[PDB]
Design an enzyme around this catalytic site. Sequence first.
Site, short mmCIF file in Angstrom:
data_model
loop_
_atom_site.label_atom_id
_atom_site.label_comp_id
_atom_site.label_asym_id
_atom_site.label_seq_id
_atom_site.Cartn_x
_atom_site.Cartn_y
_atom_site.Cartn_z
N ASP A 78 -4.88 -10.26 -0.60
CA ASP A 78 -5.09 -9.27 0.47
C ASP A 78 -3.83 -8.39 0.59
OD1 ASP A 78 -6.04 -7.84 2.71
OD2 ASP A 78 -5.81 -9.52 4.09
N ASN A 102 0.84 -1.21 0.00
CA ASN A 102 0.00 0.00 0.00
C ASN A 102 0.88 1.26 0.00
OD1 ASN A 102 -2.11 1.97 0.47
ND2 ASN A 102 -3.35 0.40 1.50
N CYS A 157 -6.46 2.73 -2.60
CA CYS A 157 -7.64 1.98 -2.15
C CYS A 157 -7.88 0.71 -2.97
CB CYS A 157 -8.90 2.87 -2.15
SG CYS A 157 -8.93 4.16 -0.88
#
Length: 335
Positions: A272, A12, A14
């Site tokens: 994920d 990371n 969205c």
Amino acid sequence: SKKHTGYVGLKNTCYMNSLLQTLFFTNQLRKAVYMMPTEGDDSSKSVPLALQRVFYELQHSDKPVGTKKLTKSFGWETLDSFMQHDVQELCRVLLDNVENKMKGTCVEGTIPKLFRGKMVSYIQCKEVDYRSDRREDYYDIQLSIKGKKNIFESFVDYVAVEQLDGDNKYDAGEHGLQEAEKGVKFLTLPPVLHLQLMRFMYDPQTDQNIKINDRFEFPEQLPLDEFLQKTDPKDPANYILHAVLVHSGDNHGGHYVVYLNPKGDGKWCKFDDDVVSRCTKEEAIEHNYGTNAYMLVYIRESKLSEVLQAVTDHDIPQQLVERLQEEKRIEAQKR
Ligand SMILES: O=C([C@H]1Cc2cc(Cl)cc(-c3ccnc4cc([C@@](O)(CO)CCl)sc34)c2O1)N1CCNCC1
Ligand SMILES: [Zn+2]
């Protein structure tokens, strides 16, 4: 982790990590992304080169792959820039850059080959001879889900004939205010079918949009011949489910997962962000009905061997491999 699943995650931002995996495992696109002539492009500014880097690193790295160079190339660095736009708009920003770079090259027309279908929006007057057609292209579809049990019902509602009577009659100009039938009709469905699901709607008493948490079903195999006008017996419109992009938690924040079936073989994985893990069909398909699935990717069965063709290290050109390694050698030693 690569050792368990075969695939690596992203770090990371969205819904981008969800989309980047989805576009990476569109193998025919990935090959064409590698063939873009990006040798005379700037490193910091070029979106084509940044997507080549992510795809290279997703193919090759054991550790999770960075997205900071890719965010900086098209200017969507902050959180509020991601929030204002939707996933289809991001998909349009990435694929337009890739398509324009592929023009005048050996791999031209790859985006419309994979993603562009065709439809006719029509208005027929009932009592007078006047018809009005527009042939439109589309790269994605936005399906309604409120009061819809499944995809079949949403495609029925997409193509459903609206009547224009009483108050809302069709202005035919010279013929006048006429009663008429408005509708849309699919001419062709593309190899890779991006279907977004309408999880938000306008509520009048609150002056603001609100989320739809309703149970919406979608199958592994998706026949769509009845929604085409002129079918083909040599090439039926049967679609295998490839990816499911999922949201959880509240709107201003939350968590963003994608489920994927990278070989089209029923062997599912959960992506994920950095943790890629194996999962069942039922965790990917059944359990993501109603947590809400917002986009789904379907690949056409006749085009599945071509779309998900085997990529190798030989499919990445030498100058690009030499370029991306020379970055990583310099980027390591800097302290
Ligand atoms: O509220 C959010 C968060 C929380 C959230 C929950 C859910 Cl279930 C879906 C999305 C989401 C993410 C990306 N793309 C899309 C596209 C959608 C459509 O329904 C309308 O275009 C497709 Cl027809 S929903 C959606 C989502 O994003 N926003 C504010 C508005 N833009 C995105 C960020
Ligand atoms: Zn798309």
